Design a binder for this molecule. Sequence first.
Ligand SMILES: *[C@@H]1O[C@H](CO)[C@@H](O[C@@H]2O[C@H](CO)[C@@H](O[C@@H]3O[C@H](CO[C@H]4O[C@H](CO)[C@@H](O)[C@H](O[C@H]5O[C@H](CO)[C@@H](O)[C@H](O)[C@@H]5O[C@H]5O[C@H](CO)[C@@H](O)[C@H](O)[C@@H]5O)[C@@H]4O)[C@@H](O)[C@H](O[C@H]4O[C@H](CO)[C@@H](O)[C@H](O)[C@@H]4O[C@H]4O[C@H](CO)[C@@H](O)[C@H](O)[C@@H]4O)[C@@H]3O)[C@H](O)[C@H]2NC(C)=O)[C@H](O)[C@H]1NC(C)=O
Ligand SMILES: *[C@@H]1O[C@H](CO)[C@@H](O[C@@H]2O[C@H](CO)[C@@H](O[C@@H]3O[C@H](CO[C@H]4O[C@H](CO)[C@@H](O)[C@H](O)[C@@H]4O)[C@@H](O)[C@H](O[C@H]4O[C@H](CO)[C@@H](O)[C@H](O)[C@@H]4O[C@H]4O[C@H](CO)[C@@H](O)[C@H](O)[C@@H]4O)[C@@H]3O)[C@H](O)[C@H]2NC(C)=O)[C@H](O)[C@H]1NC(C)=O
Ligand SMILES: *[C@@H]1O[C@H](CO)[C@@H](O[C@@H]2O[C@H](CO)[C@@H](O[C@@H]3O[C@H](CO[C@H]4O[C@H](CO)[C@@H](O)[C@H](O)[C@@H]4O)[C@@H](O)[C@H](O[C@H]4O[C@H](CO)[C@@H](O)[C@H](O)[C@@H]4O)[C@@H]3O)[C@H](O)[C@H]2NC(C)=O)[C@H](O)[C@H]1NC(C)=O
Ligand SMILES: *[C@@H]1O[C@H](CO)[C@@H](O[C@@H]2O[C@H](CO)[C@@H](O[C@@H]3O[C@H](CO)[C@@H](O)[C@H](O[C@H]4O[C@H](CO)[C@@H](O)[C@H](O)[C@@H]4O)[C@@H]3O)[C@H](O)[C@H]2NC(C)=O)[C@H](O)[C@H]1NC(C)=O
Ligand SMILES: *[C@@H]1O[C@H](CO)[C@@H](O[C@@H]2O[C@H](CO)[C@@H](O[C@@H]3O[C@H](CO)[C@@H](O)[C@H](O)[C@@H]3O)[C@H](O)[C@H]2NC(C)=O)[C@H](O)[C@H]1NC(C)=O
Ligand SMILES: *[C@@H]1O[C@H](CO)[C@@H](O[C@@H]2O[C@H](CO)[C@@H](O[C@@H]3O[C@H](CO)[C@@H](O)[C@H](O)[C@@H]3O)[C@H](O)[C@H]2NC(C)=O)[C@H](O)[C@H]1NC(C)=O
Ligand SMILES: *[C@@H]1O[C@H](CO)[C@@H](O[C@@H]2O[C@H](CO)[C@@H](O[C@@H]3O[C@H](CO)[C@@H](O)[C@H](O)[C@@H]3O)[C@H](O)[C@H]2NC(C)=O)[C@H](O)[C@H]1NC(C)=O
Ligand SMILES: *[C@@H]1O[C@H](CO)[C@@H](O[C@@H]2O[C@H](CO)[C@@H](O[C@@H]3O[C@H](CO)[C@@H](O)[C@H](O)[C@@H]3O)[C@H](O)[C@H]2NC(C)=O)[C@H](O)[C@H]1NC(C)=O
Ligand SMILES: *[C@@H]1O[C@H](CO)[C@@H](O[C@@H]2O[C@H](CO)[C@@H](O[C@@H]3O[C@H](CO)[C@@H](O)[C@H](O)[C@@H]3O)[C@H](O)[C@H]2NC(C)=O)[C@H](O)[C@H]1NC(C)=O
Ligand SMILES: *[C@@H]1O[C@H](CO)[C@@H](O[C@@H]2O[C@H](CO)[C@@H](O)[C@H](O)[C@H]2NC(C)=O)[C@H](O)[C@H]1NC(C)=O
Ligand SMILES: *[C@@H]1O[C@H](CO)[C@@H](O[C@@H]2O[C@H](CO)[C@@H](O)[C@H](O)[C@H]2NC(C)=O)[C@H](O)[C@H]1NC(C)=O
Ligand SMILES: *[C@@H]1O[C@H](CO)[C@@H](O[C@@H]2O[C@H](CO)[C@@H](O)[C@H](O)[C@H]2NC(C)=O)[C@H](O)[C@H]1NC(C)=O
Ligand SMILES: *[C@@H]1O[C@H](CO)[C@@H](O[C@@H]2O[C@H](CO)[C@@H](O)[C@H](O)[C@H]2NC(C)=O)[C@H](O)[C@H]1NC(C)=O
Ligand SMILES: *[C@@H]1O[C@H](CO)[C@@H](O)[C@H](O)[C@H]1NC(C)=O
Ligand SMILES: *[C@@H]1O[C@H](CO)[C@@H](O)[C@H](O)[C@H]1NC(C)=O
Ligand SMILES: *[C@@H]1O[C@H](CO)[C@@H](O)[C@H](O)[C@H]1NC(C)=O
Ligand SMILES: *[C@@H]1O[C@H](CO)[C@@H](O)[C@H](O)[C@H]1NC(C)=O
Lengths: 452, 53, 113, 132, 132, 128, 103
Amino acid sequence: AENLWVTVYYGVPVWKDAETTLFCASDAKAYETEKHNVWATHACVPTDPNPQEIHLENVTEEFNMWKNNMVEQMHTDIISLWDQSLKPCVKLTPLCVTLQCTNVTNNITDMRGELKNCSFNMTTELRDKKQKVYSLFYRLDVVQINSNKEYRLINCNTSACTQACPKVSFEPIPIHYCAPAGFAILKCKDKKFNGTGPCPSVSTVQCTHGIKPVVSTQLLLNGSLAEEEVMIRSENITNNAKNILVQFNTPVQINCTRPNNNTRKSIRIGPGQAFYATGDIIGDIRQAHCNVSKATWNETLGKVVKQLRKHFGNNTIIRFANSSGGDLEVTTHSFNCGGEFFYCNTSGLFNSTWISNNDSITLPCRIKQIINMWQRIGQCMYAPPIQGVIRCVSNITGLILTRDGGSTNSTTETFRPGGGDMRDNWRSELYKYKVVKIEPLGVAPTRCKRRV
Amino acid sequence: KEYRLINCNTSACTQACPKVSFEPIPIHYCAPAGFAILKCKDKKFNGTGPCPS
Amino acid sequence: DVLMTQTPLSLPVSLGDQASISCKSSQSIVYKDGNSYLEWYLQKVGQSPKLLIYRVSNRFSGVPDRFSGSGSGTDFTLKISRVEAEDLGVYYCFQGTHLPYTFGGGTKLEMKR
Amino acid sequence: AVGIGAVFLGFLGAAGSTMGAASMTLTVQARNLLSGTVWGIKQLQARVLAVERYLRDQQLLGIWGCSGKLICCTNVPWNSSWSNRNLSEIWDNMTWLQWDKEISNYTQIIYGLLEESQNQQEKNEQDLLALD
Amino acid sequence: AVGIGAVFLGFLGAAGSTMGAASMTLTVQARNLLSGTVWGIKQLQARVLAVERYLRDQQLLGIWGCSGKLICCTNVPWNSSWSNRNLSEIWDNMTWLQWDKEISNYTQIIYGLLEESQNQQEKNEQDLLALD
Amino acid sequence: QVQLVQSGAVIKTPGSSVKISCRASGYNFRDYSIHWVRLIPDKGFEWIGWIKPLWGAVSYARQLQGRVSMTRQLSQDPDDPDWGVAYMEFSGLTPADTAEYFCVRRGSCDYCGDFPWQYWGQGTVVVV
Amino acid sequence: EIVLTQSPGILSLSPGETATLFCKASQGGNAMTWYQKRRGQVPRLLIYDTSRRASGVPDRFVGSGSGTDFFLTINKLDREDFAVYYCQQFEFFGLGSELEVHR
Ligand SMILES: *[C@@H]1O[C@H](CO)[C@@H](O[C@@H]2O[C@H](CO)[C@@H](O[C@@H]3O[C@H](CO[C@H]4O[C@H](CO)[C@@H](O)[C@H](O[C@H]5O[C@H](CO)[C@@H](O)[C@H](O)[C@@H]5O[C@H]5O[C@H](CO)[C@@H](O)[C@H](O)[C@@H]5O)[C@@H]4O)[C@@H](O)[C@H](O[C@H]4O[C@H](CO)[C@@H](O)[C@H](O)[C@@H]4O[C@H]4O[C@H](CO)[C@@H](O)[C@H](O)[C@@H]4O)[C@@H]3O)[C@H](O)[C@H]2NC(C)=O)[C@H](O)[C@H]1NC(C)=O
Ligand SMILES: *[C@@H]1O[C@H](CO)[C@@H](O[C@@H]2O[C@H](CO)[C@@H](O[C@@H]3O[C@H](CO[C@H]4O[C@H](CO)[C@@H](O)[C@H](O)[C@@H]4O)[C@@H](O)[C@H](O[C@H]4O[C@H](CO)[C@@H](O)[C@H](O)[C@@H]4O[C@H]4O[C@H](CO)[C@@H](O)[C@H](O)[C@@H]4O)[C@@H]3O)[C@H](O)[C@H]2NC(C)=O)[C@H](O)[C@H]1NC(C)=O
Ligand SMILES: *[C@@H]1O[C@H](CO)[C@@H](O[C@@H]2O[C@H](CO)[C@@H](O[C@@H]3O[C@H](CO[C@H]4O[C@H](CO)[C@@H](O)[C@H](O)[C@@H]4O)[C@@H](O)[C@H](O[C@H]4O[C@H](CO)[C@@H](O)[C@H](O)[C@@H]4O)[C@@H]3O)[C@H](O)[C@H]2NC(C)=O)[C@H](O)[C@H]1NC(C)=O
Ligand SMILES: *[C@@H]1O[C@H](CO)[C@@H](O[C@@H]2O[C@H](CO)[C@@H](O[C@@H]3O[C@H](CO)[C@@H](O)[C@H](O[C@H]4O[C@H](CO)[C@@H](O)[C@H](O)[C@@H]4O)[C@@H]3O)[C@H](O)[C@H]2NC(C)=O)[C@H](O)[C@H]1NC(C)=O
Ligand SMILES: *[C@@H]1O[C@H](CO)[C@@H](O[C@@H]2O[C@H](CO)[C@@H](O[C@@H]3O[C@H](CO)[C@@H](O)[C@H](O)[C@@H]3O)[C@H](O)[C@H]2NC(C)=O)[C@H](O)[C@H]1NC(C)=O
Ligand SMILES: *[C@@H]1O[C@H](CO)[C@@H](O[C@@H]2O[C@H](CO)[C@@H](O[C@@H]3O[C@H](CO)[C@@H](O)[C@H](O)[C@@H]3O)[C@H](O)[C@H]2NC(C)=O)[C@H](O)[C@H]1NC(C)=O
Ligand SMILES: *[C@@H]1O[C@H](CO)[C@@H](O[C@@H]2O[C@H](CO)[C@@H](O[C@@H]3O[C@H](CO)[C@@H](O)[C@H](O)[C@@H]3O)[C@H](O)[C@H]2NC(C)=O)[C@H](O)[C@H]1NC(C)=O
Ligand SMILES: *[C@@H]1O[C@H](CO)[C@@H](O[C@@H]2O[C@H](CO)[C@@H](O[C@@H]3O[C@H](CO)[C@@H](O)[C@H](O)[C@@H]3O)[C@H](O)[C@H]2NC(C)=O)[C@H](O)[C@H]1NC(C)=O
Ligand SMILES: *[C@@H]1O[C@H](CO)[C@@H](O[C@@H]2O[C@H](CO)[C@@H](O[C@@H]3O[C@H](CO)[C@@H](O)[C@H](O)[C@@H]3O)[C@H](O)[C@H]2NC(C)=O)[C@H](O)[C@H]1NC(C)=O
Ligand SMILES: *[C@@H]1O[C@H](CO)[C@@H](O[C@@H]2O[C@H](CO)[C@@H](O)[C@H](O)[C@H]2NC(C)=O)[C@H](O)[C@H]1NC(C)=O
Ligand SMILES: *[C@@H]1O[C@H](CO)[C@@H](O[C@@H]2O[C@H](CO)[C@@H](O)[C@H](O)[C@H]2NC(C)=O)[C@H](O)[C@H]1NC(C)=O
Ligand SMILES: *[C@@H]1O[C@H](CO)[C@@H](O[C@@H]2O[C@H](CO)[C@@H](O)[C@H](O)[C@H]2NC(C)=O)[C@H](O)[C@H]1NC(C)=O
Ligand SMILES: *[C@@H]1O[C@H](CO)[C@@H](O[C@@H]2O[C@H](CO)[C@@H](O)[C@H](O)[C@H]2NC(C)=O)[C@H](O)[C@H]1NC(C)=O
Ligand SMILES: *[C@@H]1O[C@H](CO)[C@@H](O)[C@H](O)[C@H]1NC(C)=O
Ligand SMILES: *[C@@H]1O[C@H](CO)[C@@H](O)[C@H](O)[C@H]1NC(C)=O
Ligand SMILES: *[C@@H]1O[C@H](CO)[C@@H](O)[C@H](O)[C@H]1NC(C)=O
Ligand SMILES: *[C@@H]1O[C@H](CO)[C@@H](O)[C@H](O)[C@H]1NC(C)=O
């Protein structure tokens, strides 16, 4: 029996790394409130109501979230689907017209604009007639083209923009990723998983956990938080161009609002097309803001400073600065709240210093009605105003940082907020996953023959 | 007087090209693979219940 | 890991009142069966721990009907109808789906005076 | 409780267990390999890619001596330079992931030898039944 | 130089060679038969048509006596009016293209005879194992 | 190909401010970072700052903050979506800043990092 | 910070020979980038990630090394290749190795 005869085996558990498309699976509970309310309530399969992970044993798979392909497929799929949820809505070509604007009725102090009362001609249901109509636009949407002044919208120089139908909600619903046939999805479970390298306790799973898609720049919200302690993640920490993601342990709470009691008003641009304009401000003119608890925020910065001293030496001076500059929605804090896009100045959180040994922070917010997210060539959208005072409450899951330094050996390490690419917001929720391909045909020796 | 069309209050409407006829042509339903289509043949078939042929 | 906590931690309850303790699950506990595999444990001191009920609804044979349990996948609790002296002991919540199997903290029902 | 044995009858549970214990639960990876307007095209294309991969593997298994068998036996001997390890350590110690990365260079040679073996077996069977 | 023998192991190279020499390289036509937004629909439809054709041929081969065999043997005899040519000239002279256009009328008769043969073989096998 | 045209040489006074326009053409400008670097004669190289032109997030060296600002200009017409412009305005000039200023772009490879600099500018000579 | 010492400062050779330039770092575990700069022209990338040549670079520029010792070898010198060579890791540059004609 010194001879060994080769035997094949079909259905052997052994995988090799590969990349493929993944189909999304939204939960069927969103189907109970039907009729296109959020996206992918029609363009998405319902889930298995019985998810079943299968904890493996004595197994080591190398994970690397930075060279992952699933985050890139998600960044493509959200853009393509977000464009697919604007084509039935009304294009706002005819509203791009010369505006005659004045100040809103207010005790103007001679130091702020921030609202404009713009009258303009507009077509009617019939093609022949026309109507004078007034609206209220923000100052970040009108530009003085060169008596009362004479303005135009800012998108008119490059591209007309579809407004969003108010039957379509902007709020996230959890998106699962069920793997197709032939492939599988692994999952790290090590609580001290750095981000790159071996995770010595993996678990295969047929469909991923609840991923709610938020859109935010300075500090990501409602993001699955780590369990044992606050963690930081990077690719090369001694590199400057790569962001330094941070995931919290305790969710610090933020409250945001808009005190102006609006009045939504319908204008018929064309037959079958209606335009929604900010009609009147009853109540009082009060600026939008956000509040976090000062004590918990000082404690949470104490935790992240305790964590950052490991990678940099125990005797360094970690200090936090505000953003260096750039466009609007990378310096300020961008998010959506009830279907209306805020931009909140965050210099009031990011100023401190840290040496080796009740109230609440207010921070102002500015609002745009038109938005250009993902920075395409000729697509913006006009987010319509919403009736009444709105507010929304959110847990802060983590924040995105950025180190800087040129030379001259100083002990300080100034950190500033980041943003930039939208993909970093997804790399804080697809870090523990990896897609694999089954190769079920393996071959091995044993003692047997086949009988002729 | 001074009139307008009735659809102008809500929606403009595509007219039908006169190359497109409206008349019916018979539509058959061939079953796909794996399935089959049964057919009652009982002349006294009420609408609900067993058809024994 | 799917560690749990127990609210509250100790209830001295008189002989003949209703006691109710909850365990909250971080992740959902659903198997391919559909029944949420959670067990309720009692341990009289210096012994082996028993089983109070099964999943939420079924009951361990050799246990009286002074125990009931409720839950809807996410957060679970009990209701004890009548209190005895043998009902002294340490209680636990146990999971049966994911590895490693987690436990609750442990509650000690006491006497009132 | 579910039980730890439900891990081994589960999908891909034997991936860390030894080679002598994955052969009992080897059919679950075989069974869960097949079944499981732009989005319709993506999902349709992925599903037909999966069934083309399964059909390619069944055709490559059928031109050997085992068209419908999970376990098989052949008639070609192991060159000792392939893995030079005895029977007890490659069926009680090693895992399949480690075994796949120890013979990864020699696999096309094995497939060619199996094709030659089945070809000569077919012509020998035809020569045996030709005389009757 | 590549070599002229790489013609015969290539795809469809034996198409001009004799019938007695195409059976050795007969598996290449078997292997290259399967694997290989409007454009996505056209390419997807062509690929599923190819796998439906392959699966139809495998089902029509499986209801005979050879489910996973490239070469096969049956139990029905040749009516002499089918081709009336002896063994040496139809395995050393003729090509398969010429053979296909000499029995093109009689093929459905052959397929019906094979179906009857496998049906009676199944009932005879059931009668043989019924007595045990 | 990839081209990085700059502006010509310039003579400035101490206390003034200089603006240098690095025009980039040949690739998608909304993707890859732009870095700025300066050759001081008989002192070596020194990094200045980077800019990501998708939004314009910038970073600067520690010993140059409060002195340098960097902006960008994208291309908005869909007929030429590739070209783009970077702007560096360097203020607080001293006679120590008599140097040669370069704008660079990343390596184009998927294996190379961020700081390996493949494509370079022609060179702006700044004399204070 | 990171200090890069680059030596030899001045290397005097004749064409056809082999040049060796070594860059010492302070921290270890990173890559190293090698630039060529001729006199009065635009600088040029030679080596990125410590062993890979740039596009349009002949194979006679070989680089290796690990940890702190980083080596750049230029076998089979040319008349054109006499220039200044820099080692850049991240944003901390070297100072320069000048390659001079010997006679
Ligand atoms: C991070 O995560 C957090 C957590 O989710 C996010 O906070 C949420 O943000 C949501 C914004 O997208 C926000 O949702 C809005 O809530 C508005 C407030 O009204 C709701 O809440 C009250 C009190 O809580 C509740 O009483 C209402 O209804 C309850 O009862 C009915 C019964 O009929 C239920 O159907 C309903 O689900 C709800 O159930 C409650 O009780 C059951 C028990 O029976 C519990 O199981 C439930 O959990 C719940 O507690 C309200 O639902 C509300 O005004 C908003 O609704 C408007 O907008 C949506 C579009 O988004 C539209 O579909 C609606 O129809 C409605 O529009 C119409 O009305 C407008 C006003 O008249 C009008 O202008 C429009 O034109 C339409 O006519 C919306 O539901 C949610 O409340 C908060 N969560 C909390 C706790 O506050 C946070 O946003 C995340 N962060 C980021 C950055 O996204
Ligand atoms: C954004 O900017 C737009 C303009 O671009 C602005 O719209 C204009 O607002 C003003 C108010 O600030 C409006 O002016 C008032 O209009 C009402 C309504 O007019 C109707 O009634 C008259 C009666 O003759 C009819 O002829 C006409 O056709 C309309 O049907 C008038 O009632 C107002 O008159 C009152 O105010 C005068 C101010 O001097 C008084 O002198 C006068 O006596 C009236 O007072 C009486 O009525 C009051 C209301 O009941 C009552 O409070 C008093 O005690 C008293 O009894 C005035 O003319 C103007 O019409 C609007 N223009 C349009 C086109 O709508 C928006 O308001 C502005 N919005 C913001 C947020 O800035
Ligand atoms: C996230 O966390 C992971 C860990 O899960 C980090 O990955 C590893 O990190 C360690 C240190 O943090 C790195 O280890 C270092 O490797 C050097 C290279 O030697 C190794 O490689 C050679 C072959 O190339 C082997 O022959 C050798 O045996 C080693 O395996 C070592 O030289 C380093 O030694 C250090 O310690 C000694 C004494 O303790 C000192 O004298 C040295 O000077 C030096 O300080 C060290 O062991 C390892 O390379 C990392 N691996 C990978 C794959 O990255 C990630 O870095 C971390 N990432 C983030 C973003 O946080
Ligand atoms: C409507 O808005 C107007 C906005 O101009 C507002 O008028 C201002 O009100 C304030 C407070 O009522 C007046 O008083 C100022 O505030 C304090 C009060 O102690 C002083 O310190 C200020 O002195 C400074 O400013 C003066 C003028 O700029 C300087 O001369 C002086 O040296 C100080 O620098 C000042 O007294 C303020 O004067 C008026 N402004 C004017 C132009 O009258 C008005 O109150 C608002 N009304 C309502 C009903 O909301
Ligand atoms: C980060 O913090 C710094 C200061 O801590 C901010 O710098 C400040 O920027 C504003 C303008 O952006 C300066 O305001 C001044 O406004 C008046 C009136 O318009 C104008 O005349 C001045 O020329 C100037 O623009 C302010 O002086 C300046 N502060 C300092 C100390 O320089 C910076 O804006 C913060 N970053 C972000 C993103 O908010
Ligand atoms: C970032 O945080 C620092 C705290 O470290 C903030 O400094 C604070 O600034 C305010 C005014 O801007 C100071 O209030 C007043 O200052 C005067 C001195 O001009 C003082 O005499 C008064 O008694 C009053 O306190 C405050 O004192 C100061 N904090 C400290 C500890 O001195 C800074 O404003 C923050 N940055 C931003 C953009 O908010
Ligand atoms: C953000 O994260 C925090 C965690 O710090 C969440 O707070 C906790 O959420 C759970 C469930 O969402 C709450 O449990 C509730 O208990 C009551 C008890 O009667 C029960 O009626 C509910 O059905 C639910 O089980 C828990 O109380 C709550 N903790 C606090 C302090 O509020 C929070 O929900 C997350 N989301 C937001 C928008 O804040
Ligand atoms: C499958 O066959 C290939 C082909 O021989 C094997 O690749 C060979 O792997 C060895 C490592 O065991 C290489 O040796 C190494 O060479 C580098 C060259 O600088 C040297 O620095 C190292 O110290 C080491 O000696 C060898 O070069 C390489 N062959 C070729 C042609 O590159 C491969 O290992 C085989 N697979 C298995 C699982 O054995
Ligand atoms: C398969 O069977 C068919 C059916 O018999 C064969 O077709 C027959 O072919 C012969 C030629 O060999 C035809 O004869 C010719 O008829 C025409 C009629 O005008 C005449 O002008 C010619 O001179 C010649 O005699 C015969 O008519 C035809 N049968 C029918 C019904 O049309 C076919 O040849 C068979 N296939 C093979 C490969 O033999
Ligand atoms: C509308 O608001 C603008 C901005 O305050 C006013 O324009 C100038 O405001 C400055 C104060 O910052 C004054 O010093 C100028 O005198 C204002 N210009 C004029 C022509 O008055 C403007 O007055 C406001 N009102 C209107 C009707 O435009
Ligand atoms: C589109 O219109 C905007 C708004 O006027 C232009 O942006 C301004 O351009 C001028 C001169 O180019 C600058 O001085 C302003 O600072 C710009 N303002 C803003 C807010 O960017 C823009 O140049 C126009 N683009 C095209 C292609 O016509
Ligand atoms: C954010 O808003 C919520 C809701 O208004 C606040 O939660 C309440 O806060 C009050 C005190 O302000 C307490 O009396 C209530 O018991 C809280 N209710 C709940 C359900 O938490 C929250 O405090 C606000 N956060 C901040 C930082 O102000
Ligand atoms: C669309 O236009 C039609 C035609 O005028 C409107 O229908 C009339 O509405 C008035 C008042 O609402 C009634 O008195 C008439 O009896 C209606 N006539 C008919 C034939 O229905 C209709 O209200 C308009 N709808 C909208 C949304 O503007
Ligand atoms: C927060 O509290 C710590 C503890 O004393 C202190 O060192 C730190 O300066 C405080 N920071 C702020 C912003 O209050
Ligand atoms: C840094 O300081 C912390 C203090 O908590 C200590 O635990 C750790 O070992 C120190 N590490 C080094 C490298 O000094
Ligand atoms: C041969 O097998 C025995 C166990 O049967 C094992 O102990 C021994 O190490 C093996 N020999 C080699 C050379 O691997
Ligand atoms: C029979 O076969 C022989 C060769 O074995 C051949 O020469 C002969 O022609 C054949 N007979 C007929 C009738 O074809």
